[PDB]
Amino acid sequence: GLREIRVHLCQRSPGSQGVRDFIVQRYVELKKAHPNLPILIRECSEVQPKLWARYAFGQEKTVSLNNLSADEVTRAMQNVLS
Amino acid sequence: TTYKNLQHHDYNTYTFLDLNLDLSKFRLPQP
Amino acid sequence: ALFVHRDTPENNPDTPFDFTPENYKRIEAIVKNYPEGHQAAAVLPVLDLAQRQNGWLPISAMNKVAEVLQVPPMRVYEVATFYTMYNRKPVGKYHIQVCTTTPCMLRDSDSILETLQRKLGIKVGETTPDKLFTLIEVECLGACVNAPMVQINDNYYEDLTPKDIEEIIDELKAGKVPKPGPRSGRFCCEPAGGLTSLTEPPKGPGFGVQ
Amino acid sequence: SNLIEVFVDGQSVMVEPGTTVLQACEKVGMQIPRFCYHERLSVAGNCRMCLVEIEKAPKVVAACAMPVMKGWNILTNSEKSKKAREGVMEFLLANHPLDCPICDQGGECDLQDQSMMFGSDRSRFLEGKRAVEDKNIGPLVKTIMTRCIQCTRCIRFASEIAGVDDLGTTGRGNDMQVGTYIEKMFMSELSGNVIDICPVGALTSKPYAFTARPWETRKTESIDVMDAVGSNIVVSTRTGEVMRILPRMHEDINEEWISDKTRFAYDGLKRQRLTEPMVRNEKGLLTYTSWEDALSRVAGMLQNFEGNAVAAIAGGLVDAEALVALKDLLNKVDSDNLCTEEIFPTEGAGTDLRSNYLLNTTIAGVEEADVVLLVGTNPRFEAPLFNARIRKSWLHNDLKVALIGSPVDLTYRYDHLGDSPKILQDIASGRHSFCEVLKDAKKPMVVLGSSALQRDDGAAILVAVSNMVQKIRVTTGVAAEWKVMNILHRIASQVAALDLGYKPGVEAIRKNPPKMLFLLGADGGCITRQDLPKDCFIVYQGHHGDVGAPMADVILPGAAYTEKSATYVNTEGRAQQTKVAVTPPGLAREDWKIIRALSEIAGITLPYDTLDQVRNRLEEVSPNLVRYDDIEETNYFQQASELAKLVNQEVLADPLVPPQLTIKDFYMTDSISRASQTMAKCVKAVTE
Amino acid sequence: KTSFGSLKDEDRIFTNLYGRHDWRLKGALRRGDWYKTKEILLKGPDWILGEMKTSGLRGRGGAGFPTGLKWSFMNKPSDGRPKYLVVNADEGEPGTCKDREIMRHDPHKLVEGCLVGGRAMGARAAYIYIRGEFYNEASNLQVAIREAYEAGLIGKNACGSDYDFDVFVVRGAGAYICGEETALIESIEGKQGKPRLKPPFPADVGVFGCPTTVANVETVAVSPTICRRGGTWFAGFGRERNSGTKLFNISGHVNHPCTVEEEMSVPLKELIEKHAGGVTGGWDNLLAVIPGGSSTPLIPKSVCETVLMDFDALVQAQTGLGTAAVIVMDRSTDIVKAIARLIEFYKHESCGQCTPCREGVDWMNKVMARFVKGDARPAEIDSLWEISKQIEGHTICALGDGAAWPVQGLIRHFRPELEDRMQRFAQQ
Ligand SMILES: Cc1cc2nc3c(=O)[nH]c(=O)nc-3n(C[C@H](O)[C@H](O)[C@H](O)COP(=O)(O)O)c2cc1C
Ligand code: SF4
Ligand code: SF4
Ligand code: SF4
Ligand code: FES
Ligand code: FES
């Protein structure tokens, strides 16, 4: 099963606008629907946006969100959650 | 012919502070 | 003597001391002489008042002044140690202070000091066993023209001679307080032989106005 | 612009009005001699050593105090200036005692250096020197006042930086004496720094006295872990031993000072120290063994167990590398009960958003704030340098401070809004009088000490504080680039653990008692052997044998913060790394190395073999942990508040009491502090 | 024009200096105080400052700084803060006793001076700082102040001028240093009498952080008479920049020590013979004189036969009319012992704040104590001189100058005596 989601994004870069607006839009409705699942939003300057997902016995799978849009980020989050 | 400043021959130890307290009424409101 | 405090049975942070009610009225009068706030300015007059009430400034007296004026106690310790008219050790009933600076020494203050110490059977800086007299050496006390000169408490006895000093010490020893001022027959600061200046009537209220 | 032109030996330099002659000379490069002047303190002008000659002027000015004027030519190598310096040095040295061999300011003495450079080479003073009497000023500071030069840096520091008003100058003339008129004790959380500011050796440290000379010591640059401030420090080492701890200038954190605990707790590192692997608690008493044996037993137990039956606790002095190593190990075992000793509300957004648990305004923004609300905290005894910054702002940039907690002496005037957690709702709804100040405030702050969060109503407290913060933002109309909500931490590893995702609070451990506990420097005593099953097999992994070590089926000695290169994040989110000063004592090994070796001995092997690979793992987990000395900003506190609103809890009516209510409680907090001897002396002196 | 002295009693400002006329308001009005004060006040501050300037009055305290110029620094447009006029009645200079008489025999002169000077400076109050020793003089001063308050001359609207003025009397304790401007301000503020750094100057930040002007008792007390009788009348006396009448305290070895008032620039011989009777044992039995107070260096009989009591004249003679406290010594005196006592005075009175004076006045005291006995050696006179020059220009306050100058005067005019005493000591 899934144990974590870790969303890394840039504080203010063109390639992280989709992720940044995804947080503002859908983050609340996701943390209020999967209350027991951590969703660690960690930002760092000049970082490459990348979603991190850790499953059962310490198996972590990564994707990319650079230059992706809000709906694409939401689709990726839904796919990892399902 | 005769010395006039004799009133200080009777001042007690509290004369200064008594005079200051008396002037406290005349003193104008502080800033 | 010393600028560090060591507690003893007397002069202890708990040794009794407090202003009388009339002294509290005087304290209010003193404090109201400075702008709002800025009341720490009264530390000097208030501490002098405490000394006038007691006779010397015990650590309890310093702490009480600091508390009533709302200043850190170190701000009062600094003042008490810095200024020389503040007595941090008990002083005799009459505090004799013989001026010794050059203008008086030239007019023989040494003889006055010698006669005083010989009469009181003490050395400069010591208290009489009766706790009645304390002899110290002080710098200029103003009135350098009436030299040699001494101060007993708040009075000036000046133009002194050995006979005069031992006589005004006899009066204090017994009773009564000798009248202050020069004892040389000249009232004060004037030329001894005779006036050489303001020897004619002063002029009217409007003399010489533009 | 509004800049004036001045000449330093003819070298034109641009300086704004108000710049002093000393600062103009510094801009050019010349370093005028000085004693009494300090950059962080008020100018005094006592020593007169900084006298310099202004061209076509009669007398010499005091460079430290004289404001420069247009067209002035400052001659620094002139005959008049050099003769003034020689005379001033002669006067300084006239009454000085010949104590150089037995003086702790051996090779660090500014009087020595400036006598060699700017003074004369002989003495014509043919009299008897004065001799002041020494005074007892507590167990931490030794007073050899005969060396004092009456510079008054100590007095100024105590009056301004520490706000204690205990030291002063008594008497006058050549008999002037610096100290407490009475037999006071100079006890404060910042008392030690007087030792640094004393230019001569009049004030020195009792624990360090006579031990070594400056030219011998090797100066390493590391970070303090006695609190969440992260005070940059310099560790002085001589032949593989810590000689003393000194401050390191960091304008954004330290500012040259360090707390008394940070300074004087280094003694603990040399006592009650775990120095060898130790096992066999089931057979009776703990007995020494070897790494390959203790790790074999640990690996056997780990292989036997799995799932939530295994759990870990991180507490106090732990490093991000060890935390991530342990997290990866337990995850590979399929466990997630890796907790930390200090609680944090995890009901709202919890640790999902970094803005929910960081001093978002940073330490240095206090000077930019207008109003400060200290909620249920005692800044003086937790984050003493944060309290120092608050006092600096209050003293200089007119600041206002209010406290919603127990009334304690913070060293500055503040409004006591009461010690009830319902005042938060009162302020939020506008029923309290403090809203009047909050109205005209422009740059508010609402600090919330974690000590308050560690109550059983911490969730309610945090929800209330955030809900008040939202209304403060809307009414005050503060920009989006000014963060008001802050949380002040008191544990070094709390922020790093939260970033790595450790579950705050040890609640899941009690919910599902594990069959194998993994204590990693967990001396807080939150979980005892009474909890857990009847044969839990606890594993202690730390440097000191304190509360945790006795309860254990195996001890694995780790390294202290002075012996390992470790990443520590402070309360404001800044990531900093220490440097290896000493080497681990005996068979002790780095904590992340021990974890990785245990992994490899077990079936599960971790994918790092070097510090840099562990750092890359940290980058993968939380990117900000590897950007050193850089404070990444944060966002979505609107989202944090949105999620907090939905939390349904009520603030218990109990008073908001700080755990450290008096100075006596400041000196014992960590394992090192509890094992320190000097801290015990300080505790006894305060209690007396 | 030339040849000064023989001031007529018509022109003496202090007409009760000797105390044989009533000093209370009743006698002060008879002698001419508080006359046309309302007119003087309503003539404005600019007119008063102009009168003081054109009079040429120079600060009667230690250093002589033009009074009009010094008081004009507070005539600047209001900054919204109160302005104060602090009167420096801490007569601490050894040999000086003139302020004592001005305060105990003519307090109303000082009080009206406070009023007019406060109007000129724009001040609202005027704290008088008087020694703690001068208890009876402070008591007389407050009796006079209360008389003024009760007569309406001060308070709500002074003399009907509509100007609000208050006179506060503040007593210090034992401290010669508290006569210094900034030290006096600090003492009033309640802290230790330790001089501040300059700049900022008192006229910019003063007592309680507001503008202030420290003035001598004589300087403030002369002002009402200057205003009434015209600045030109005051300028009539004296040479040029040294204008006015001065109170002289002739003390030491003189037949009739006295406090007298005389024309500025009166010859020293005339001052010592006409009023004080003459140096004990005749003019020939004269060794040296200290024209100023104690901070002024000596002048030997050779230089004092023709010196003129003036700022410029004594500066030319290498001394300075500090406070005009003539101290006379008559040959029989032990000159080095007397100067050693003066240096001991400065050692006792130094505040101790700043290193030059703190650590160098004690050095000079020790060396001078050795010199009095001859224990030192002739090569040490130049060491003492060099120490004096090191101390002179490097102190925060002028007390360092005052401690250095007497030693320089001794080393400059009586070096052979020092060498003779050292030789006699070495002969044992
Ligand atoms: C150590 C020291 C002691 C002093 N005592 C006195 C005094 O009794 N009266 C006085 O007018 N000035 C005294 N002064 C000088 C004052 O600082 C200041 O120059 C004077 O009060 C200004 O008054 P004026 O402008 O009328 O001259 C002293 C200065 C120093 C440095
Ligand atoms: S402070 Fe110490 S090292 Fe420096 S000169 Fe004095 S005794 Fe010598
Ligand atoms: S003890 Fe040290 S810091 Fe304090 S005044 Fe003396 S030399 Fe300066
Ligand atoms: S010169 Fe002497 S009295 Fe004046 S400030 Fe310096 S130490 Fe104090
Ligand atoms: S020298 Fe003695 S009163 Fe002045
Ligand atoms: S450094 Fe300027 S006087 Fe001390």
Numbering used by the authors:
A (entry chain S): 14 to 95
B (entry chain s): 30 to 60
C (entry chain E): 5 to 214
D (entry chain G): 6 to 693
E (entry chain F): 9 to 436
Please, what does the article write about this entry?
Mammalian complex I (NADH:ubiquinone oxidoreductase) is central to cellular metabolism, with key roles in NAD+ homeostasis, respiration, and oxidative phosphorylation. It couples NADH oxidation in the mitochondrial matrix to ubiquinone reduction in the inner membrane, reoxidizing the NAD+ pool to sustain metabolism, and captures the energy from the redox reaction to transfer protons across the inner membrane and create the proton-motive force that drives ATP synthesis. Complex I is a ‘boot-shaped’ enzyme, with a hydrophilic domain in the mitochondrial matrix that contains the cofactors for redox catalysis, and a membrane-bound domain that transports the protons. Here, we use a popular complex I-linked mitochondrial disease model, the ndufs4−/− mouse, to define the structural, biochemical, and functional consequences of the absence of subunit NDUFS4.
In the consensus class 2 map, the density for the N-module is substantially lower in resolution than the density for the rest of the enzyme but when the N-module is locally refined its resolution improves to the same level. The resultant N-module model (subunits NDUFV1, NDUFV2, NDUFV3, NDUFS1 and NDUFA2) has an all-atom RMSD of 1.20 Å against the equivalent N-module of the wild-type (NDUFS4-containing) reference model, and the density for the FMN is clear, in its expected location. Thus, the structure of the N-module itself is closely conserved in structure between the wild-type and ndufs4−/− enzymes, but in ndufs4−/− the module is not rigidly fixed to the rest of the enzyme and adopts a distribution of positions relative to it. Within the ndufs4−/− N-module, residues 61-68 of subunit NDUFV3 that are adjacent to NDUFS4 and resolved in the wild-type enzyme, remain disordered even after local refinement.
